[PDB]
Amino acid sequence: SASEFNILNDGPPKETYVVDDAGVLSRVTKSDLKKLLSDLEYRKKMRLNFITVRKLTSKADAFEYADQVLEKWYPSMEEGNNKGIVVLITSQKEGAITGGPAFIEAVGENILDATVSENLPVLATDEKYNEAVYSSAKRLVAAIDGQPDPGGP
């Protein structure tokens, strides 16, 4: 709960694009994520955030919390329309992605749940959190830019 609370309380990571509460991402990867993602915001006005958490206290799943985070960080249509929230539960190897309609439409449902059922669960199961997260960001960015799908792990 302290985790679930802090993640929600400390608003969105405006400069870093990441909240690695599970502490599974390295200095370098977070750096790469920031570079990759601030470039996405600069070019497409799409704001994509990643969150890692060890586990949820609630019986609620990843999607539920992701949506709770979206609503908290961007309480209005105008503020959240172009936002994307990716949540990764490391102890469960489970992921979720939600966001505003524009973000959702710009990515598309195909890649949306492909990322969620492939990159996140598969890579995290193998303990490769950094590649789990970076490849997911990279695959979401490709979709938004209407580039070829790199595919899953």
From Swiss-Prot:
Main localization category: plastid
The answer, when asked if Chloroplast is one of the entry's keywords, is: yes
Q: Name one GO molecular function term.
A: mRNA binding
**Keywords recorded for this protein, A-Z:** Chloroplast, Membrane, Plastid, Thylakoid, Transit peptide, Transmembrane, Transmembrane helix
Instruction: Indicate how the chain sits in the lipid bilayer.
Output: Single-pass membrane protein
Name of the featured protein = UPF0603 protein At1g54780, chloroplastic
Cellular location(s): Plastid, Chloroplast thylakoid membrane
What's the superkingdom here?
Answer: Eukaryota
Which stretch of the full sequence is covered here?
A: 84 to 235 of 285
Protein family: Belongs to the UPF0603 family.
Q: Which GO terms describe its cellular component?
A: chloroplast; chloroplast thylakoid; chloroplast thylakoid membrane; nucleus; thylakoid; thylakoid lumen
Species annotation: Arabidopsis thaliana
**Gene Ontology BP annotations:** photosystem II repair
Keyword Plastid among UniProt keywords = yes
